[PDB]
């Protein structure tokens, strides 16, 4: 019975994890902005998107989108944050307007308190990316369940 | 519902007026929150926005003129909005906010007129 919801939980941590994959290893090589008060490749701080602790952000390049078509992959925004010890994704669909837009958020995964991301500059792992040329090597997205603790995944990026 | 809105209606050109947002459902203290509006033959248009902590932003064409707040003992947040101009009318919404000028979890709305 409490093995039911164990192994619900494991299906839920892989639903998190293949939503992180399509993301981090579809990292869209172009420059996005944070429209509050600047511009970068990858965006990584405290308080991101409003996040609880560490918020991250940066252009993902999607191909096999449902609702629209076009065949060279469409570049879109993507982020992920801590809310109420929940992981959650911020998608933006449209690009960036003085308007603004209508955040997507989507809750990936429960029992989550804390968010962190180390770069890979091709020798040594860092803590932060100021770097807003070229992406870093490879990217280490760990996870701080209040359950498992600390899971870690390593993405490789595509490079240009 | 999670952000229901009050306090609409039609005001004379240059008068005053109090918007008000009910919270409820999530930690309203805890989360970044904002205004956005409607006006007719316009899409959604972020208006301003205040976070946890307290500091506020506003667009260019409202900056010292409507004024963001937020009361975390009865989870409201607020907009007074004054010298209101025809050019404001528009269905304002109240929102959460991601910082920059985007927003989620948008509410109903409340009409605000002028003319």
């Known amino acids: 019975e409490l093995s039911q919801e164990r192994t619900a939980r494991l299906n839920e941590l892989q639903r998190a994890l293949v939503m992180m994959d399509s993301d981090f290893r579809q990292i869209a090589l172009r420059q996005t902005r944070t429209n509050g008060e600047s511009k970068k490749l990858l965006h990584w701080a405290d308080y991101l998107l409003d996040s609880d602790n560490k918020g991250i952000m940066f252009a993902r390049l999607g191909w096999h989108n449902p609702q629209q078509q076009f065949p060279r992959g469409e570049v879109t925004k993507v982020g992920y944050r801590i809310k109420d010890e929940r992981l959650e994704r911020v998608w933006w669909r449209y690009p960036d307007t003085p308007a603004g837009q209508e955040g997507v958020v989507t809750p990936l995964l429960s029992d989550v308190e804390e968010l962190n991301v180390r770069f890979y500059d091709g020798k040594q792992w860092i803590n932060e990316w100021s770097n807003e040329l070229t992406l870093p090597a490879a990217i280490s997205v760990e996870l701080t369940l209040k359950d498992y603790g600390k899971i870690a995944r390593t993405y490789l990026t595509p490079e240009g | 519902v999670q952000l229901q809105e009050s306090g609409g209606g039609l005001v004379q050109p240059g008068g005053s007026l109090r918007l008000s947002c009910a919270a409820s459902?999530?930690?309203?203290?805890?989360?970044?929150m904002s205004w956005v509006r409607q006006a007719p033959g316009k899409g959604l248009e972020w208006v301003s926005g205040?976070?946890?902590?307290?500091?506020?932003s506003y667009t260019a064409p409202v900056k010292g003129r409507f004024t963001i707040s937020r009361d975390n003992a009865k989870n409201i947040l607020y907009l007074q909005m004054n010298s209101l101009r025809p050019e404001d009318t528009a269905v304002y919404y109240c929102?959460?906010?991601?910082?920059?000028?985007?927003?989620?979890?948008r509410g109903q709305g409340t009409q605000v007129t002028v003319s």
């Open positions: 929102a959460k906010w991601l910082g920059g000028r985007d927003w989620y979890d």
């Open positions: 205040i976070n946890r902590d307290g500091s506020t």
């Open positions: 459902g999530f930690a309203f203290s805890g989360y970044a």
